[PDB]
């Protein structure tokens, strides 16, 4: 009941108040306790993917929202970890919205921290939802996120060794399958590290 | 009360660039109470103003 009414008002103010960056004054004006913060982030992502198309206002509301307090960005890290557990459970059309919001917050990189480690599943084990969505978020996030500085700066950020599928050298299927999937997805020279390491 | 003597807007591109500065000092966000009791702090329309009662 509390999450149903909280989602009814959160969705009512979500569909209203154009330029949601200003609507954050109302969202924070609701004064929801810490118990409603995690449910407000999960239901906030549900309303973000509930639209008929990818909306940048959801990415801005998540960037400023999660960027407000410590438990906010923490709720974005844990909520992103719970979002990584969706995979095939997520909708096909909503996967592009999750890749647009996750690519928008990933372009800023502020709130997400270990999200780069939670991604990159194994070589032959995938639901194709995280592979296709990883290709959409990798292409769009590569275009708008400064891919040369994102891959070059990400190589020294220790995000690749923290990710399972991004690990070069030892594992032949991770580096080789990462070179075939990356080069096949349009990464180009970004897979040269796993290609030479493999 | 009202806008009083001010009609709508009066300004100039050269006057604003001379009076103000794109790069200037920033300390406090222009406290209105500071300019209230200090008619020299706010130079906009100082006409027919009874003010400046110092302390107590």
């Amino acid at each position: 009941i509390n999450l149903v009414s909280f989602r009814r008002t959160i969705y009512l103010a979500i569909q209203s108040s154009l330029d949601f960056e200003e609507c954050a004054h109302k969202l924070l004006k609701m004064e929801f306790p810490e118990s409603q913060t995690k449910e407000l982030c999960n239901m906030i992502l549900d309303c973000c993917a509930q639209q008929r198309t990818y909306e940048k206002f959801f990415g801005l509301l998540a960037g400023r929202f999660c960027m407000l307090k410590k438990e906010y960005m923490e709720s974005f890290e844990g909520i992103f970890k719970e979002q990584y557990d969706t995979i095939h459970r997520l909708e096909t059309n909503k996967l592009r919205n999750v890749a647009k919001m996750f690519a928008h917050l990933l372009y800023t990189d502020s709130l997400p921290w270990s999200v780069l480690e939670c991604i990159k599943l194994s070589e032959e084990t995938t639901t194709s939802s995280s592979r296709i969505f990883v290709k959409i978020f990798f292409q769009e996030l590569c275009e708008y996120m400064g891919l040369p500085k994102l891959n070059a700066r990400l190589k020294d950020e220790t995000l690749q060794p923290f990710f399972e599928g991004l690990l070069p050298r030892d594992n032949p299927r991770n580096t080789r399958f990462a070179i075939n999937f990356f080069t096949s997805i349009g990464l180009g020279g970004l897979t040269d590290e796993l290609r030479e390491h493999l | 009360f009202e806008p009083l003597v001010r009609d709508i807007n009066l300004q100039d591109e050269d006057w604003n660039e001379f009076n103000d500065i794109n790069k200037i000092i920033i300390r406090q966000p222009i406290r209105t109470e500071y300019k209230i009791a200090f008619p020299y702090l706010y130079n906009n329309l100082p006409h027919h103003v009874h003010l400046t009662w110092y302390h107590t």
Binding site: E22, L27, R64, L68 | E2, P3, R6, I30
Partner: peptide, 30 residues
């Protein structure tokens, strides 16, 4: 007309929207 914001005529449009600072302006300032 408050500091930095105000409407000369409060009766001019609708009602005076008691604005504050927005829970997001502090996020952008920090």
């Amino acid at each position: 007309m408050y500091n930095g914001i105000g409407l000369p005529t409060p009766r001019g449009s609708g009602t005076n929207g008691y604005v504050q600072r927005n829970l997001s302006l502090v996020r952008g300032r920090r």
